[PDB]
């Protein structure tokens, strides 16, 4: 598993308004599990509160394709042309609503203009035309 | 050395009041060199601008004892009782002035109450009896408009 | 000519403490003149005041070597190994003092870590071991109370 380890969630976009937008994010850890599954852990600062999220990504028979939220969501993990970056694209149900999302992951926290421009091209091609939000980063989350 | 690698500068105090009042700091990198020397690199955000500092720490014959600034300053690298923390203590010339400083380093950015309480005792004992500054942390420093 | 046009002064270092350190800078314009000379125009914000500088760089017979400040300074202009960046290194008199400086120029205002790391190697090799200041960028400069 190459996608294993420490990642920075640097940018996100979607097909719908996301009012669930964080104020800061901790690094994302993807832990490789039995049977090719991935456990994603991240902490988000939303409304003064540090919310710790854990999402298990269930491996399918298609490489790079995962399910989550008990099948209500399909997540595609694709490499960026730009080094040290990966793109998540997801479809299906989140919090009752049905939303398509893209997330830009990087090994490094440093902003990459090149990775962002590529993330824009990818996203707008998939018909995600909302704003691209580049997320504030913090190694820890403080109320 | 054990001290090699990535550190968070989590707290600092001094004998004077330092004009170096950062708004955030990047991690401190101590890079091992030929002959047991250390290159200390850190970046500080001050008023929209990034101060990229590099200090070569010249190994002496005394473990934990280093010089810097052409012998004009002495730096003691001392382990904390508390796990994954170190204390830097320094005496001599910095930017022309005489100043003594203590800095608390940790492998993790999470503040440790135990490490901080010990760093307070260390500081008060050494006559670095000003306020202890806990620094804002950022993995990067970017100037305004860059 | 290669150096002509719009630059961002992104980083600066020196061999002496520069107390006259800028808080913000406008872009540097290098205009090519008759006979291979260069007119450098920049505005710097220093303690609420705008320094509108025009420096004529007088071409010599040595490629990349210029004099300026009515002969009080010699300026070496080299490309950076890193793309879309240039390095100025200068020796001589500034504000009634002897001081050696390096300046990192870029076509883009966005930080390049590669250009900065290279600028450090270049500077430390010329014995400029002070902090590398990465400058805040502004299209305009306005004095306090204007």
Author numbering:
A (entry chain C): 29 to 171
B (entry chain B), C (entry chain A): 29 to 174
From the paper:
Eight dog (Canis familiaris) allergens are included in the World Health Organization and International Union of Immunological Societies Allergen Nomenclature database, among which Can f 1 is a major allergen (Pomés et al., 2018; Schou et al., 1991). Lipocalins share low sequence identity but have conserved structural motifs, characterized by an N‐terminal 310 helix, a C‐terminal α helix, and a central calyx formed by two antiparallel β‐sheets that enclose a central hydrophobic cavity forming a β‐barrel for ligand binding (Dartt, 2011). In summary, the structures of Can f 1‐hIgE Fab complexes revealed two unique and partially overlapping epitopes on Can f 1.
This is supported by the results of our MD simulations, as well as crystal structure analysis of bound and free forms of Can f 1.
